[model samples]
Target: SWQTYVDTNLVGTGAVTQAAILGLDGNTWATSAGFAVTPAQGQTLASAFNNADPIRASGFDLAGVHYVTLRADDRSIYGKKGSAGVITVKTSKSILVGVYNEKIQPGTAANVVEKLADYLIGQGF
Candidate 1:
């Protein structure tokens, strides 16, 4: 189940090299490349905006961008993470999503991440 989602969400849908999803309470659901950092990232982010619905943060030296919808179990980060990047997100009290990718452009990567988060939500993450 988790493995399937790992591929489906990251390489399949996100069209990126890395991505991760976390449950509301801070448990990782799936990730691309099996990277372990996303769960921690998810926890920090989920706690940041406890009551927020949806938000996006970008321009992190490490992660280029992120789209958040905590209640819906989503946090999508774009741009290369785990290197020269420091990123975080705050969401409602629910699912956390993280996506990592290349910085194709300023708003371009962010838009893709947001769209993928929405798609994951529809799939019941």
Candidate 2:
């Protein structure tokens, strides 16, 4: 199940504190207990994959905290706010969002999320 995926493969590893999955069309699939992305936020995030300039122009927010865009591309959009931030990876069918706290290295957190997205893409998700 997708929930199991979020619970085990993502949050369970301790690489990140929160995780979520959203379709390319902005529909949510799964999200960790502490994290929530509003409908508008999901739509904005989904659209950024097509053209990231808007996100670059104005940073985005998640879980009520504003994040500065660190990197924005077709396959990924990474953001940071102090030591805590979010890593977003895009697969063919969906987007994987991983939230990391000050305790985790951003790259380590990003790797976990990206790896799962890669696996999902390979499975034809």
Q: Pick the candidate with the highest TM-score.
A: 2
Q: Residues 32-83, candidate 2: write the lDDT tens digits.
A: 9968987788888999999888889679977687899999998989999999
lDDT tens digits by residue: candidate 1, 1-125: 55564576444654445555556665666555645644455555554444333334432221234343222223433333333222222233234334433543324434545655566556754
What residue pairs clash in candidate 2, if any at all?
Answer: none
lDDT winner among the candidates? 2
Instruction: Report lDDT (CA) for all predictions.
Output: 0.44, 0.88
Candidate 2's C-alpha runs over 4 A off are none
Question: Listing every candidate in turn, what is its Cα RMSD in Å to the true structure after a full C-alpha superposition?
Answer: 6.9, 0.9
Query: Model 2, residue 20: what's the lDDT?
Result: 87
| True lDDT of residue 70, candidate 1 | 23
